[PDB]
């Protein structure tokens, strides 16, 4: 995991996106490409359209899933069985 000194890594794009999203207390679907961005308690209500590789998966953040990264909730490989 990332070192504690450096602070959590959140991309600036979706950062300013969520500050402009929460300033009026409305949570519309936000579409992003940065899977590497962690989850901040400022994302508690917002729902992200996180990229997968083909499309964007909708992920509704909760209190439980804070501290993880977005890419956890956008599974890439599709395997059903042989």
């Amino acid at each position: 995991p990332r070192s504690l000194k450096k602070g959590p890594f959140v991309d600036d794009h979706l950062l300013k996106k969520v500050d402009v999203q929460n300033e009026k207390n409305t949570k519309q679907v936000i579409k992003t490409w940065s899977r590497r961005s962690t989850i901040i308690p400022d994302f508690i209500g917002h729902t992200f359209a996180v990229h997968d590789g083909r499309k964007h998966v909708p992920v509704f953040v909760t209190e439980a899933m804070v501290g993880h990264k977005l890419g956890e909730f956008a599974p890439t490989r599709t395997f059903k069985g042989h």
Binding site: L4, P8, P41, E63, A64, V66, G67
Partner: peptide, 11 residues
């Protein structure tokens, strides 16, 4: 609470 774990981890 996970949020408290964030605060103690990073603050």
């Amino acid at each position: 609470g996970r949020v408290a774990r964030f605060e103690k981890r990073y603050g």
